Every structure is written in C-alpha cells, then in structure tokens.
Design a protein around this ligand. Structure first.
Ligand SMILES: [Cl-]
Lengths: 237, 226, 225
C-alpha cells in the first residue's frame, strides 16, 4: 500500500499501488484510487491506505450517500474544505462503529477541484482532522512512503509541469516496488489538469505496461551510469 | 472446514464442506424472499460461535420490530448486521470465526463480503472477486489459475469443485458431503442448491478427469534440464 | 376484551373472549407430560401481540430463558415481567397478562402481570384474576366461586360471567376460547372454542336467564316503610 498525490500550479497528479494486506495469508489486489465526478462541475479523488475494512466502508458510505440529495454528500458540498470535513466525519463514524485501538486506523488523500475554486489537496488522519497541501508542501504520501520520498524531494516543486510530476510519481513507485514487497503492481494513476473537470486521464498500469517498463529501465540504467562516473573516493588521511 | 464464494459478472458461486473437528454440519445457509432478495451465509471457525450467529440471524428474521436479514435495505446493511451480531456473541463473556456473506437484494447488483472475527468486513471487487475461509490454501492455486471476474458461472463452480477436490485430498479435516450453490444474476432463486455426496456422479467424473488430466501433462513434460 | 382465570385445589379454568377494538387472547405453551402454561391478554393489542410473539419466538432458542425451560411458574412470571419491561424500554399502551398452569414438580400456580412488569400471585384467599372489561362479570364469581369449587362449576361460573359481559358490553364478543386444566394432567384436551352456535353455551345462558327472572318474580313484595 503506497499512494501519492501532488498539487501543482497547472493541476494534480495521483498514484496508487494495489497490493493490499487483507489477511495474513491473504495478500490481494484492491483499488486504492476512487473517483467522484460530475462532468463540467466537479472532480474529487480519494486514495486509501491502512485498514482495508475501514477505507472500503468509508468509500462505500460516501458513494451511497451521493445518491441521496436530502443528505450532505460529496456531490453537494460547496468546497473541497467541506468535502474534507465530510471525509473526517465518515472516518470517525466507521472507526467508532467497528471498534465497538489503532487496529482500525486509516489515512486518506483527497484532491481535486470543485467549480468556482482552484485545486485543493488534503491529507485526512485517523482522528478525522486534516491538513492541506500548500506551495511549500505540494504533495502528500500515505502507506509505505519513505522509499519513494527522496526522489520527490529532489525534483518536485509547485511549478513542475504535470507530465514531469507523473514521471516523478512513477519513479517513486519504482523505488518503492524494488525495496518493499508490501507495495505491488498493478498501479492506478491519474492526471487532472486545472479547470478541466475531466477524469479522461485515468490509467491502470499493469506489469505489461510498455511505458512503465521503459521508464524503469531508463531510470535504472541512468542511475548506475551516474554512479559509475562519480569522481573517485577521496577521504583525508 | 473450507468455504469459498465467488462474485462474477453473471452470478455467484458457493461451495462448502461439512466436516468439523472433534460429524456433519451445514456450512452454507440461505435466506430467500422470492423475487426480492437472496442472501447466502457461509461459516468457519469455532462451531459453537458460528452456530449461535446463524441461529440468531434466522430467528430474528421472525421479529419485525428488529433489524434482520429480511428487512435490511442493501447487502451492505446486511454485512453490518452480520458484524453487529458477531460482536454481540463474542462480547457476552479460541472463539474466532469467519463468515462469507453473499447474494443480491432487489435494487443492487451482486455483493459479497468477508466478515472477520472482530465484526468488521471487506467486500469483493473485480480485482479480488472471491473469498476463502477455513482450510483454504490447498485449494487456492487452481482458483488463481483459472478464475477471473468474467469467468462464466458453470466454470466458476467447476473451479470451486476442483478446489474442493485438491483440498479433500490434502487435509482430512475437510470432508464430504458438500453443499454448493449457483446464483444467476437477478434470479432471486435458490433452486440451484445441491448436496454433493461421495456417490455424486458428476463430482466423481470431474475429480477423475482432472486427476487423470494432470498426470498426463506431468508425463508430457520436457525432460529435466538443470 | 375480557379474560378470566381460576386457580382451585383440583385444577385451573380459563376463559377469554376474542372481540377487539378476531385475535387469540389465550395462548398455550405445552410440553406433554412436563408443563402446561396459559397466557391471557388484555389491553393494548400492539403491546400484547409483541410480548406474546417474542415469547413464542424465544421458545425456539434453548440457549435463552424461555417458557419451555423455566424451572418454576415463578420464573415464568419473572420472565414475562422482563419481556414487559423490555418492550416498554424499547418504545397509552397498557397491557395486562394472566399466567396460569403447572410445571412438573410444582403445584397449580396463577399470576397477574401488570403493565409495569411486576406481578401478583393467586392465593386461596384470592383464587381468580380478571383482566379487561371485568366489572360486569365479577358479581357472579364472588357469589359462587371459592378455592374448593370443582372445575366444572368454576367453568360454569366463568361462562355465566362471560354471558353478563357479552350482554352488557359490545367491545366483548364471541367466539370464546376456554380451557379446563385438571391437576397434574399436563393436558390441552379440554381446550374448546365457543361460537354463537355452541349448544351447551346457548343452554346455560337461557337456563340462567330464566332462573333469575323466576327468582325475581317470586321475591317478597316491596316493603320500604
Ligand atoms: Cl517489482
């Protein structure tokens, strides 16, 4: 389980793996990127990490309540901020219900655009409160995230163009897949351009995906080549 | 004890054994309202605990003033009901059990849940379209090899039966007779419900054909080159 | 709705009407050779039907206290109270219950369960209970019933009591559900449904009515001075 979301000047980039810990001898594939879309008006992305029972209920409850107009839901909140308070409430509701403890804990990412406002990206914590990405901290990670942080810190900034942001996310995934077996393919990714209100650029990346194969091969060969050409070791004695 | 449930585009398939560690016990129970709902529940773990749960759920179906499997609005509220009942039984002073919950309530598609000993649960997806509970490892590889979300109902049940076959053979705590069920989408019928005994003709057929088939592939294998 | 129950040395007699504003107002919990329990209802129909249904449903669960596994009629009365209170806490809806019968190893016992869920037990001094529209039928019971009255005459008493009630109050109506329970019998054989066409019921009513008119006419003349 590894998810990353990036908020840039020109749009948002999202990346999630799918390898999920459902039981001890039960390691399976579950989608960790879900979409809430009303064409021409709103696009909201939710990414899941932590207890699978918890996040699935959260997502299922949010999806069900979107069909009920007489209730506050992700389709009628006026801003992304309200969407975030709503997730926080749904997080506390599910955890308190299931725990009759950290066993039931989850972290979520919420990003997107509601027409009339710019891009917004949140990290929702298990207690139901949350923080918002800024230009100083333009990305969030949940799940097994440390392996993939160094590349993000090196190349991503608020002004990085979207294609380079998605490239950065894919390498972050590459380094994470290589170093920790709890993170696994297939991937679910998406690029959301500013003011597009489009989910057209949503993609599933399997082991057979030609570009992911290529960028992993290009990056891997690229690093070893830089490594081999480093100036010789010179410690003082 | 081994139970497996599969959620496919065309329906649901269920298979349960009946042996429990010291006789014959039902491990697949059905709740039907003709034309409106079909719910299937499978049991594993502490026999006393699951039997208490199933018993509570069926008897409370007779109580119209309480939330029960006949009046839950969606398969999700039903999972929630199963979860509440689990905590209720455990809390009242190894008692772990697992349940599978599957079927269809009018107004929704097919839904399948895995209920854990803690009362929380997960739902089957296109990415993970089946669940196993009990002694499940023996029978997992064939499922991974042939089952996918778009697998037809008849082959999915064929897969479940082979899965049972490899399991019956490798662990003697799992035993005949079997109880199996096929639920075609939007049917709300429990008609394709079956008890499979050792004397069951097709089951004898499918085991022997598969068993014979494997020895042949093995025999035709290229010579060892280490 | 009018129900009456009698506890005598030799057995128990029960009679309930069925008009409501047809529903059964006398229920049986029977285990041949072991126990015979009768429950009678008056008052709020929603409450009473809910209480009775929970009790029957729980008889199907042996891991729970129910009317089939309680050790004594006292425990049966306690259980009824819990169910009364349970329904109250869940949700005016007044209800009253009569609980009578026998569990083997114990004698005849009869209880009146109140809306609050507490209860009283019949004694030799107060050997019958009434619930519902009960005042019309009380004078004949006081006149002829005592703890040692035979079952059959107690049932005759109950029927005459119904008769005065049927005649005086239109919320009480046929058919009747009646039962005679002989001591140590554990039998539901002498349970009967009494309709408008019942020959003996017709007979005692006309027989009783005619006698009273006859005594009345034979009274010594009025002398108030
Ligand atoms: Cl890998």
């Amino acid at each position: 389980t590894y998810c990353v979301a990036m908020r840039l000047s020109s749009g948002l980039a999202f990346a999630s793996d799918s390898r999920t810990n459902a039981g001890v001898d039960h390691i399976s594939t579950f989608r960790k990127l879900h979409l809430f879309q009303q064409p021409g008006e709103r696009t909201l992305v939710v990414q899941s990490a932590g207890n699978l029972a918890t996040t699935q209920s959260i997502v299922s409850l949010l999806q069900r309540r979107c069909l009920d107009p007489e209730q506050t839901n992700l389709m009628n909140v006026a801003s992304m901020y309200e969407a975030a308070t709503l997730l926080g409430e749904t997080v506390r509701e599910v955890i308190n219900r299931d725990s009759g403890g950290t066993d039931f804990n989850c972290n979520l990412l919420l990003g997107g655009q509601i027409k009339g406002e710019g891009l917004r990206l949140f990290h929702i914590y298990p207690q139901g409160n949350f923080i918002e990405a800024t230009q100083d901290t333009p990305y969030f990670q949940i799940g097994e995230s440390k392996y993939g942080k160094p590349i993000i810190d090196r190349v991503l900034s608020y002004d990085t163009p979207l294609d380079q942001a998605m490239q950065c996310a894919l390498i972050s995934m590459d380094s994470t897949l290589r170093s920790n077996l709890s993170v696994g393919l297939p991937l679910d990714v998406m690029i959301y351009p500013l003011d597009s209100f489009s989910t057209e650029q949503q993609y599933r990346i399997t082991e057979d995906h030609p570009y992911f194969m290529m960028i992993r091969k290009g990056w891997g060969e690229g690093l070893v080549s830089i490594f081999a050409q480093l100036p010789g070791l010179k410690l003082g004695r």
